From Swiss-Prot, chains A, B:
This is Biotin-dependent acetyl-/propionyl-coenzyme A carboxylase beta5 subunit. It comes from Mycobacterium tuberculosis (strain ATCC 25618 / H37Rv). Component of a biotin-dependent acyl-CoA carboxylase complex. This subunit transfers the CO2 from carboxybiotin to the CoA ester substrate. When associated with the alpha3 subunit AccA3, is involved in the carboxylation of acetyl-CoA and propionyl-CoA, with a preference for propionyl-CoA. Is also required for the activity of the long-chain acyl-CoA carboxylase (LCC) complex. It comes from the Bacteria. The gene is accD5. Belongs to the AccD/PCCB family. The chain holds residues 367 to 548 of 548 of the full protein.
Length: 182, 182
């Protein structure tokens, strides 16, 4: 997936074609093969290609955007110009399921002593962490998201955004060429 | 191997490190996996890297150099500055072994019908072709090799070459960046 998008992004940038990405990743496909085959190395090609791009860049998160997945899929701080998120956006370090495990390490400690029953407080906290953090507003407040608009507005937004970014002047530092991971 | 070299070559070029190539490849490793995994696509990277480089390039063929492998290996027409070859070099389209099958096609066709002895004919032809075409002089005469020198002379030759190409001038086509296969 990464090499597919990485080369496509680089091609678009070569011929001044704006890049519009619709982001909905939970993360990276788990597996030893991915690692053995070089997911780190080969996956980094997407980051490089996108960070290097100078054409207009508009990213729309319709749903999931966790961990490094969020970083590679048109992250504001990766150079994305305009970033939009739908009400169903879930921008977070990781899923609430595995998030409570770390965040609520202590409260889960006594869970094996006093009121035991992991599944009621390891399931309640999950839904509590999910209903208070897993959303687009935490990122919207950090500016990582320009605005949280209703799905229907996407079409008109990209239209106007592409006009504003039309004469976008941008370039990379002086150098014969970069050293993208082959 | 291709990817391993490709990236390395690009790195040298990034930081102005002359690229010295010791050639001796009989070709590419056969196998369905090599294909399925994308040898064509990934193999190109070594080609891309070298063709892109602008740093002094010196190539020395110590023995074998067949077909495409010959090309991708700092070949003269690939942009290499100085190409050297050892008396034991075997520069050709392919090994004399499978060459006779194409070249002396008809002659071998009448080795099964009329005068039949193939395998004692296919070994005489394989030797004649080998002793007349598979050598460093065909290429040297074409200019693809700057000179055919003794192995001992190698070290000193690379030394003067590096000096000559010291302040080499190489200008790559104006472009935000290339589109090397990923």
């Amino acid at each position: 997936a990464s090499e597919k998008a990485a080369r496509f992004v680089r091609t678009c940038d070569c011929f001044n074609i704006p890049i519009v990405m619709l982001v909905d990743v939970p993360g990276f496909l788990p597996g030893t093969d991915q690692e053995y085959n070089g997911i780190i190395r080969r996956g980094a090609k997407l980051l490089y290609a996108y960070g290097e791009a100078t054409v207009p860049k508009i990213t729309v998160i319709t749903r999931k955007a966790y961990g490094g997945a969020y970083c590679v899929m048109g992250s504001k701080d990766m150079g994305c110009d305009v970033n939009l998120a739908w009400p169903t956006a879930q921008i977070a370090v990781m899923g609430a399921s595995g998030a409570v495990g770390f965040v609520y390490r202590q409260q889960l400690a006594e869970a094996a002593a006093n009121g035991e029953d992991i599944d009621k407080l390891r399931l309640r906290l999950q839904q509590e962490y999910e209903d208070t953090l897993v959303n687009p507003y935490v990122a919207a407040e950090r500016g990582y998201v320009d605005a949280v608009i209703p799905p229907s507005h996407t079409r008109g937004y990209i239209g106007t955004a592409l006009r504003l970014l039309e004469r976008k002047i941008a370039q990379l530092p002086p150098k014969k060429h970069g050293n993208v991971p082959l």
